[PDB]
Design a protein around this ligand. Structure first.
Ligand code: NI
Length: 341
């Protein structure tokens, strides 16, 4: 049945709750972002109001064929009224179109639902600074101190420098990047820009990117694989067998592959700096796993919460085991005692 952490008290609202059939009492279904664990259940047969960003609404119409009459896009950073309740959508610094949601309850309570997010100090100067938040529905994906990772900027610098060196040494090397959802576009777009190529991809993936309001996108992507030396493939194909196969398909235009797998966290992070990352190599194929995250590190999460000072925290991630829930609750108390709230 729908879990409590997907319901907003004192309203008829749910968040990212599309796989439970008709949730009894629900007058408006909010969707924070277009990732499958969150939209699971939507289709052209859905006949309740969906509230989301413009970009998530483009994807709902074009990719899942949700009928337009049920899509309610809201602009960001703008006080809106939904079924008599003031709400605001904020940038979540996750994937394109991803938002957090501020609810202003008729009784005076204010609730923030982070959706999936990567906390940033820039959030401390949004409309969040303007009033107190009583309850926080928190993306706790990496809520444990082992989860450190570098800035997105440091990761993209490593990727750009590695790709540029490789192709300048061997003008017959092909660069391949994995994907299985929206998000992490900067990885392949940054590499294509430094090499003076467009990124080549499948028609399905091309259609998905054309829904994202990215500036000058017609200039950066293409479905003509022959004219491109950065190819995007399913993440499943980023292994030695899949890459050898793809190389055969290119008809001897290329004699080497340099491939990137943008993972979240991997336990090479506890020890290894970004400067010291190495690939796995077999023959003329090298694969780099790079720690490009769209979720908060532990420290980023902690800073956000200690700045916000909520009265109650409700985790939305890693809630399925008693040891995980108990561990998170211990961190929340440490943070509260250290900061004084
Ligand atoms: Ni997500």
């Amino acid at each position: 049945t729908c879990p409590f952490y997907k319901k907003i008290p004192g309203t008829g609202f749910t968040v990212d709750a599309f796989q439970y059939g008709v949730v009894e009492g629900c007058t408006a279904y909010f969707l924070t972002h277009f990732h499958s664990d969150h939209y699971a259940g939507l289709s052209k047969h859905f006949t309740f109001p969906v509230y989301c960003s413009e970009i998530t609404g483009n994807l709902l119409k074009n990719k899942l064929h949700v009928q337009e009459q049920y899509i309610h896009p809201l602009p960001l950073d703008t006080e809106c009224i939904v079924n008599g309740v003031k709400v605001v959508l904020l940038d979540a610094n996750h994937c394109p179109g991803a938002v957090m949601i501020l609810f202003y309850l008729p009784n005076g309570t204010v609730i923030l639902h982070t959706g999936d997010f990567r906390a940033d100090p820039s959030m401390e100067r949004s409309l969040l600074a303007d009033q107190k938040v009583h309850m926080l529905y928190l993306d706790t994906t990496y809520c444990s101190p082992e989860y450190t990772f570098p800035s997105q900027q440091e990761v993209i610098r490593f990727a750009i420098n590695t790709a540029f060196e490789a192709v300048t040494l061997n003008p017959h090397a092909l660069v391949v990047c994995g994907t299985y959802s929206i998000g992490k576009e900067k990885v392949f777009l940054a590499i294509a820009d430094v090499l003076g190529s467009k990124v080549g991809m499948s028609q399905e993936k091309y259609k998905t990117l054309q829904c994202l309001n990215i500036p000058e996108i017609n200039s950066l992507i293409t479905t003509d694989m022959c004219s491109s030396l950065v190819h995007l493939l399913p993440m499943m194909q980023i292994n030695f067998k899949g890459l050898q196969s793809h190389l055969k398909k290119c008809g001897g235009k290329y004699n080497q592959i340099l491939a990137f797998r943008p993972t979240g966290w991997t336990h090479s992070n506890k020890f290894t700096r970004i400067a010291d990352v190495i690939p796995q190599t077999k023959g003329n194929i090298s694969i780099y796993g790079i720690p490009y995250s769209e979720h908060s590190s532990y420290l980023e999460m902690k800073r956000f919460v200690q700045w916000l000072k909520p009265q109650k925290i409700i985790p939305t991630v890693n809630v399925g085991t008693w040891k995980s829930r108990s561990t998170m609750e211990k961190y929340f108390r440490e943070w509260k005692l250290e900061a004084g709230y």
